[PDB]
Write a protein that binds this ligand. Structure first.
Ligand SMILES: CN(C)S(=O)(=O)c1cccnc1
Ligand SMILES: CN(C)S(=O)(=O)c1cccnc1
Lengths: 265, 266
């Protein structure tokens, strides 16, 4: 991949792999989310941020953490197809940062998906969320477009909707989910794509067989440790809409909450 | 990727991804095994197949299944590195087929890994193994080198060693392992790379932190269903550390896999 001409965004092409597709021979939403993360990492490397912590952040032991992830897919690329992903970032004042993505069919040039994510600053050791400092914001502003550039521009759209907490009893559940070493990143933390898979595990197999996932919105509240056990809960709220909740098996401590939207094939 | 000049082997280059690496910033053995499967699938597609089912196999409802997988890694590629993989197949008479791989550093040209796998023919519906018929063998022989070409040629080598069954009690164990939808392939069967991860789950974290996996040999006895639960068992058998492995169903203890791993100090 490479930065665009202005150096304010990054593009990369991916050929969809055999083990990356589901029963419809098209990429799963977890493959999509892995590709978004990969192009995001490559964008940070290309502009000198060898995740994307500034020099001031490293000094104060500060990192970027995902607070919200929102994905909308129109067409899932088929096995062997080339998908082009463009990514860019933007300052969100002082409450955090935003990373957006546009997915296109490399052959037709048509938009087949779009994603947005909200990131917040956190002390890596105490896990205490912070507001972004002035001297921190000026070292990454020069790498962002100055005028607003939104993957989800529409005034009051799905990407910024408030998500409620699922009430017991859940309609559906998948209990005792544990991460394995493949679910951990290079820093031994559970990678955020695993939570998408765990949320989707409580959706019944018949819904997966007859519908395609169009929208997924996820709020990240707490991280899951490598020795933690998770329960995945789903209730239909409706196209089919579902309310989701991931919580620790024992005490029931909330780790995630979300919503999915599915349309008949 | 592409077939070589003679059309008897296939090469493909891969750039190692961020989520594909472990704590050392190098590709995991599961990333390697996924790449081997991907280049294998692309080789079958490039020569006219659609996995590697001949016309006679489709007529009789027959498929290729892995019986044994053997991987030896000298250097795991780092994140952002380009790895080149060459793959080819060879008929093993009526026993079945063999698929071999060579992994090279694209910049240095040096061999950094090699793998071999034994495949057997099975009826899709009854799951009954069978020998390769003459009609089937002639349909794929023209796509293989005629003279032997072995990734593991050595007259006394690890790839053909008999693996014993682990005896209870196991030294280490990881219980209650279940596959999720990400662990299933396009035909909704548990992907063979998941079994490698499940085998590795019973290795203690301190061994993983201080050693690197050099060799892994896996025998496939039975498939794990999407609603099945697995127990992973390990016992040390040994500088280098060797382990004996066993995957079995949580309930009745029905064997699904058995294997051995070899690790060297970093
Ligand atoms: C400069 N890049 C666009 S980036 O993705 O590395 C980034 C974005 C926001 C904060 N810090 C770094
Ligand atoms: C590339 N081909 C040699 S292949 O892998 O499709 C194959 C191998 C053995 C049997 N049938 C098909």
């Amino acid at each position: 991949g490479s930065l665009t001409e202005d150096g304010l965004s990054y593009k990369e092409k991916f050929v969809v792999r055999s083990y990356e597709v589901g029963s419809n021979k098209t990429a799963t939403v977890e493959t999509i989310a892995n590709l978004l993360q990969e192009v995001g990492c490559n964008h940070a490397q290309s502009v000198g941020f060898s995740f994307a912590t500034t020099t001031t952040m490293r000094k104060l032991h500060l990192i970027w953490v995902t607070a919200r992830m929102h994905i909308e897919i129109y067409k899932y690329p088929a096995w062997g197809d080339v998908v082009e992903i463009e990514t860019w970032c933007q300052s969100e004042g002082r409450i955090g940062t935003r990373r957006d993505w546009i997915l296109k069919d490399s052959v037709t040039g048509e938009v087949t998906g779009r994603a947005t994510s909200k990131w917040v600053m956190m002390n890596q050791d105490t896990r205490r969320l912070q507001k972004v400092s002035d001297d921190v914001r000026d070292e990454y502003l020069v790498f962002c477009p100055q005028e607003p550039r939104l993957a989800f521009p529409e005034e009051n759209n799905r990407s910024l909707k408030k998500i409620p907490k699922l009430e017991d009893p859940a309609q559906y559940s998948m209990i005792g989910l544990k991460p394995r070493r493949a679910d951990l990143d290079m820093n031994q933390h559970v990678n955020n794509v695993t939570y998408i898979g765990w949320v989707l595990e409580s959706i019944p197999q018949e819904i997966v067989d007859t519908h395609e996932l169009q929208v997924i919105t996820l709020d990240y509240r707490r991280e899951c440790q490598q020795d933690d056990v998770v329960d995945s809960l789903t209730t239909t709220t409706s196209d089919s809409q579902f309310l989701h909740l991931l919580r620790l098996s024992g005490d029931g401590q909330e780790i995630n909450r979300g919503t999915t939207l599915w349309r008949k094939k």
